[PDB]
């Protein structure tokens, strides 16, 4: 943005006088303009404009005329006011921005109300009355007093709507997520500015449909620039979000009002309304006395005398109001008349001519209150002031409008605070002290205008007067103001460098060009165009520069330079670009001026003392105009002695006055000198933010001592008490002296915990209070802490911190949460190595919380680190816990990574075979530096090799080398390839089936869920692709199956996943392969590919890899070099942090990859949609709509026609696609295809999909690194494995010379990523935590027969190797060979002791082990051992289909079904809709969930995508569990249960319930069909098999496509016929054997799977032949069989005695209902 720039001096261009500025050259007066020199003073009069008659037809609107829904909240009103009637149509029937200019007190309120009512009327909902959660309305009033006024009266009018209106304004650092539950926020501009600088601000503003600007003429005030920021900000977000927000502005009648209309985007023809003085509520005649000379006391007696004679044209009936500038003067000024109105011949005495108890009886009976009030009450007098008066204040308010109170002098505060208008008002003086300017100045234009808007009572008056006593000198300014003539200007130049910084920090402006555009949104721009001369711009300049391009560029340059000086922004004149600093970020967030930041940055240092920190606060530029006056020096000398902190060298300079002012505020010292009170209020109202700004500065630099000091200083200011004092002071219900009494003792607070109420009451010598003091001591927040540590490397430790609440919760005391800071400090407590925010929600109090983080360490190790957990609110509420390093064993240092040899890139011609080279010749000429260096050893060898390279490097083909070499040596070679993730498996299967079965014609196969059909693939295949649990369940029985033994090559991909969840299964199957290899003496080649590992040696030597053939490369040696940028966001609350990341994401795309492709990973499905729409809408507001679509819309339209997501079509048209799991596998393939072609430039994808994407970008942006766990009610970090994978996608070897990645994370995570991304990952094993299932299977298969075998098995593992390398990780406490053997033994012992207590194995002779029934079936079905433990524990003789689902949903395999956000509510809804209701059902229990999903699937209910996806994962393991249940019920001999369980198998398969009609298995049937079937007689599937074609579909609605599927169903539907016989039925006897032979045969050849469209897995027909005695409920014998065409089934048992035994024979499918035959019979 290089262009000629000129440094301005703002002090030259600024309107110095602020509000008091008059661009008003002249000034004209009305008709009556008489001037009367009573000569101590000039009186200028202007009379009341006659009432303006009703114009062109326009007439008042009786309330019943506006629509029915709006009537409400206008109670007590017969008719609309004239102004309100003029705009009822605009405010109610249109959504147009309005600018309503009217006289003060015109009643602009009810107009804003009609505007609200329109928005409220937009969420009707028929029966349900309001959609209170769907919208929000912000209302900006400009005074704190007015806001409270408004909340109450808007509160009233909208009760009948059930709408919540609440104040937000005040100093209170934002919290309340019940502001998430209020719809009308009422606040001040500066409050709303603070909120909306947050960036995650879009959590509040998300729903804001309408914002209202009361008293918008504040534009002109020194506070004006805040309004200009709000509106500029708001307007600009309307364009970026493209969601419409309505702006209503309400103003007084002042010049420039039409420039304000333009500012607010008001259509002049449609929504501009201006109403001159005619439209006053009550016509006011007005006097403007200015006065002639100095003469202080004389000038005031002048003034005080003026007041009497004016009131006394009102004797009996009339009310008066006087305004003064001091809560002291409410009485003093009413005294100078008390000393006059009655002092000269009791003039006008008896203002209440009820010298007869008319008004006095009600006035004298209310006298018994305090001060000047009881004093002034018995006659018509009263007072109202800002000097805290509370409940009596609200009682001078009723008795005034009840009309007993005659005279009431008051503070400006009342004009704003409550709507009580007098008949006349008089304004004494117009001079006020301003702490910020540090002088007296002329009181604000806003202020006056509100006061005279109180002359005359709307329902009770016909005229009103208004007298304004000011100084004659240069105060015809008030004539101007009060007669529609003082123009409204822009004060934006004053506040320009702070305003700019907030936008830079917000991400709204990244350079000067952006900033110049920003200025175009401000009121300044409009005003400079319209009156350029006034804003220092020559008519010549304007004429050649009509858009003020030179001025805005200059203004911004000048500001940028101030911010750069003060180190708030980094700004280079060259590019015009801006970079935010931390200092600037804090400045913006805490509302500190940039000069103050500089001072802080200059003064703050680790060794700053409390003395010096009180000093630094004093030097804050917000206080730079503060002087020490003479009349106050004595009192400051007095305060200095009573406060605690020494105030050095500073004698009474202003530095020291500010210093002691703060200390006296914390000490709650009383004051007198009102000049000093206004200064104290001004430094304390600020002190909160300034301290907290200093805290955040110092926290983030790591300064431990100063972080402690400042945090306490914050708490002390908030809590108004010293650290010295008693923490019991924080409980406001405790009487003061009771507490000073506990302080009077030299007794530590801590020791109160150990004292009972008696001993307390005793120590205090006030036994009355013993009990309640006790209550409060235990309400004090208190945490217990416990730490667990594990070394990771010699620099980093993983730390699990367990936080245990130990206090009583009272929501009156603690509310809905308590926040804490977790601080990890070094030995000396000088440095914070790590910190983070912990929010203890109330719902989850007294739950244990586990916070996990990593901390650095340095080899000359200290003895201790400390962990402090300090409250963020309560004083003296901390808890420390040392972390000893005395017995810590750091791991063995790692070797360097293998060198990268710059070899001349090997051509494809180095592969010699011509058939082979065709697979690569047409893709590239030369392999990458890793593939070539490796090639030597993997193509030209038969030995074991390990490749370690950053994901993306192209490891896949290194494995190919080996497979090519195998097909070169073997004809029908056998090769197994194992990837950890299933999603990777399918990706490699497509990739290779075409490369190896299409191209090279060898078989290539993919293992599935079923063992028998997989055993075949294992046989015919030359390349077998599999996930670990699949290869495990096969090769477990490697002794039996030969095919496992004769494999030539074994390829493991992503071996680093061994350290991941589900790593065990991989480590196991790998170790087994190595074991099998040494034992079969025909070595198996093992080839492992992995991410860069620090400890690759250990994985190499584990898998038999020499150091010659072990290739482990550093991340920086990646073929396509990566540019990592880690970007932190200090926002603890996740929903907010995600929102504040949205702008940075677009800036990331435009900076790092404007043309080239991008992938954004987001944490979830609905985030994927939201993030894409944002990129789009932001793209369109950047005026570059569709800059991501790199073809033409027509080019895409053939493809998009297929899709069904309306939104995916819309985003794709615009250049952005998204990938979540709710999309058809087709739709996903489309999006990826279009991305790889380059047609679309950006894909947003959910993190669950970083494994199943064969798509690469130029830039990868990870948007947050956390996801919610509904099981522990907390966000948890992405596995570093997922993040490593995501990053690997920023990699296009062919085109890009670089890849780029931007990770956006919470700050607390930042340092974690900086370590473990620029460096190699270390893996450990978690075998020891999953030891059982593998031993139990090894024992079943007699690979382990004794304890020594168990111990030797383990020598083959990775576990075995790492234990000695990092003992402390495994909880080994030494490293000798002895420690190893011990721990190994201790390990096998417990694992076998568990498996035996669990009834799976038998321990005999202490050394020998054997498989038991439970053990054998858990290995057979691959079910966790605790699962069958639970089955046998819970199944009984009487359990039915209902109880069965309950037990099976309790399987451990369902532990991992996750709970996600708001599924807590979703599952509760399911719960009321399913057939079976649960008792004590915990909705964050994965077992309660899989229960409901189980009944949901049976009911055929369709659900949300991630419930359906889970339903599939549940159904995945469903069948193997039921089968276990059969085995266990039969092995116990229970008949009716085992039958019940077989029904469940077939009814989970077909997706129907126990009493569901058998016809529900047939395609396209519904309840409507079945009812019109029982009416005929059709109740069976066989009852439609005998029917012929014409009668068949004559029954109900058919289509040619319906008949097709249905008739094909009945052709796979089992038509079996049975045959049985008792072998030697007559020569059978008691105790003896009985052999039963059952003959099965079907009249149909078997081709096709089991058809079960609702079951996500293709399964084959299993059958159960059973024999039982129904009378006793006895399972006699059973056999499970897959039948094909026909077969002989043999089952025997042992006869009981006495001949006659009646038996039953059962034939049971595990897949269909209605095939179940029964045959009765007898024997003996």
mmCIF file of N, CA and C in Angstrom, residues 136 165-182 185-186 191 195 203-204 815-817 839 873 1133:
data_model
loop_
_atom_site.group_PDB
_atom_site.id
_atom_site.type_symbol
_atom_site.label_atom_id
_atom_site.label_comp_id
_atom_site.label_asym_id
_atom_site.label_seq_id
_atom_site.Cartn_x
_atom_site.Cartn_y
_atom_site.Cartn_z
ATOM 1 N N UNK A 136 -31.738 -11.516 20.181
ATOM 2 C CA UNK A 136 -31.248 -10.593 21.194
ATOM 3 C C UNK A 136 -31.360 -9.127 20.723
ATOM 4 N N UNK A 165 -35.163 -8.753 30.593
ATOM 5 C CA UNK A 165 -34.284 -7.608 30.351
ATOM 6 C C UNK A 165 -33.396 -7.313 31.549
ATOM 7 N N UNK A 166 -32.083 -7.317 31.333
ATOM 8 C CA UNK A 166 -31.142 -7.097 32.430
ATOM 9 C C UNK A 166 -30.052 -6.087 32.107
ATOM 10 N N UNK A 167 -29.601 -5.397 33.143
ATOM 11 C CA UNK A 167 -28.455 -4.514 33.048
ATOM 12 C C UNK A 167 -27.229 -5.373 32.838
ATOM 13 N N UNK A 168 -26.208 -4.784 32.244
ATOM 14 C CA UNK A 168 -24.938 -5.451 32.080
ATOM 15 C C UNK A 168 -23.848 -4.494 32.528
ATOM 16 N N UNK A 169 -24.113 -3.195 32.356
ATOM 17 C CA UNK A 169 -23.136 -2.145 32.663
ATOM 18 C C UNK A 169 -22.702 -2.120 34.132
ATOM 19 N N UNK A 170 -21.547 -1.507 34.360
ATOM 20 C CA UNK A 170 -20.888 -1.544 35.647
ATOM 21 C C UNK A 170 -19.460 -1.968 35.389
ATOM 22 N N UNK A 171 -18.660 -2.036 36.445
ATOM 23 C CA UNK A 171 -17.262 -2.412 36.290
ATOM 24 C C UNK A 171 -17.084 -3.922 36.120
ATOM 25 N N UNK A 172 -18.103 -4.697 36.504
ATOM 26 C CA UNK A 172 -17.972 -6.157 36.624
ATOM 27 C C UNK A 172 -17.400 -6.861 35.382
ATOM 28 N N UNK A 173 -16.192 -7.412 35.539
ATOM 29 C CA UNK A 173 -15.518 -8.125 34.458
ATOM 30 C C UNK A 173 -16.421 -9.254 34.019
ATOM 31 N N UNK A 174 -16.729 -9.260 32.730
ATOM 32 C CA UNK A 174 -17.836 -10.046 32.227
ATOM 33 C C UNK A 174 -17.810 -11.522 32.597
ATOM 34 N N UNK A 175 -19.003 -12.039 32.857
ATOM 35 C CA UNK A 175 -19.203 -13.454 33.076
ATOM 36 C C UNK A 175 -20.620 -13.804 32.632
ATOM 37 N N UNK A 176 -21.515 -13.900 33.618
ATOM 38 C CA UNK A 176 -22.905 -14.356 33.469
ATOM 39 C C UNK A 176 -23.322 -14.978 32.124
ATOM 40 N N UNK A 177 -23.441 -16.305 32.102
ATOM 41 C CA UNK A 177 -24.046 -17.003 30.965
ATOM 42 C C UNK A 177 -25.567 -17.062 31.146
ATOM 43 N N UNK A 178 -26.074 -16.146 31.967
ATOM 44 C CA UNK A 178 -27.495 -15.844 32.010
ATOM 45 C C UNK A 178 -27.759 -14.580 31.175
ATOM 46 N N UNK A 179 -26.684 -13.916 30.738
ATOM 47 C CA UNK A 179 -26.749 -12.912 29.664
ATOM 48 C C UNK A 179 -26.952 -13.671 28.362
ATOM 49 N N UNK A 180 -26.648 -14.962 28.433
ATOM 50 C CA UNK A 180 -27.069 -15.941 27.448
ATOM 51 C C UNK A 180 -28.579 -16.251 27.591
ATOM 52 N N UNK A 181 -29.174 -15.826 28.708
ATOM 53 C CA UNK A 181 -30.608 -16.025 28.953
ATOM 54 C C UNK A 181 -31.441 -14.732 29.102
ATOM 55 N N UNK A 182 -30.826 -13.569 28.867
ATOM 56 C CA UNK A 182 -31.579 -12.313 28.745
ATOM 57 C C UNK A 182 -31.575 -11.812 27.300
ATOM 58 N N UNK A 185 -30.326 -6.700 26.556
ATOM 59 C CA UNK A 185 -29.193 -6.139 27.282
ATOM 60 C C UNK A 185 -29.313 -4.628 27.244
ATOM 61 N N UNK A 186 -29.195 -3.983 28.392
ATOM 62 C CA UNK A 186 -29.200 -2.529 28.432
ATOM 63 C C UNK A 186 -27.849 -2.079 28.979
ATOM 64 N N UNK A 191 -19.327 0.145 27.830
ATOM 65 C CA UNK A 191 -19.485 -1.256 28.217
ATOM 66 C C UNK A 191 -19.547 -2.129 26.977
ATOM 67 N N UNK A 195 -16.974 -5.316 25.747
ATOM 68 C CA UNK A 195 -17.493 -6.581 25.268
ATOM 69 C C UNK A 195 -17.106 -6.830 23.818
ATOM 70 N N UNK A 203 -20.194 -14.423 20.336
ATOM 71 C CA UNK A 203 -21.033 -15.298 21.137
ATOM 72 C C UNK A 203 -22.222 -14.513 21.684
ATOM 73 N N UNK A 204 -21.989 -13.229 21.963
ATOM 74 C CA UNK A 204 -23.042 -12.301 22.386
ATOM 75 C C UNK A 204 -23.781 -11.786 21.166
ATOM 76 N N UNK A 815 -22.008 -18.889 43.429
ATOM 77 C CA UNK A 815 -22.736 -18.742 42.191
ATOM 78 C C UNK A 815 -22.664 -20.005 41.364
ATOM 79 N N UNK A 816 -22.499 -19.831 40.056
ATOM 80 C CA UNK A 816 -22.489 -20.964 39.146
ATOM 81 C C UNK A 816 -21.083 -21.472 38.824
ATOM 82 N N UNK A 817 -20.059 -20.760 39.286
ATOM 83 C CA UNK A 817 -18.686 -21.257 39.191
ATOM 84 C C UNK A 817 -17.670 -20.471 40.022
ATOM 85 N N UNK A 839 -11.779 -23.694 35.495
ATOM 86 C CA UNK A 839 -13.100 -23.193 35.868
ATOM 87 C C UNK A 839 -13.869 -24.298 36.547
ATOM 88 N N UNK A 873 -10.549 -14.708 42.363
ATOM 89 C CA UNK A 873 -11.509 -13.787 42.961
ATOM 90 C C UNK A 873 -11.353 -13.626 44.478
ATOM 91 N N UNK A 1133 -12.490 -20.436 27.470
ATOM 92 C CA UNK A 1133 -13.790 -20.975 27.087
ATOM 93 C C UNK A 1133 -13.846 -21.364 25.605
#
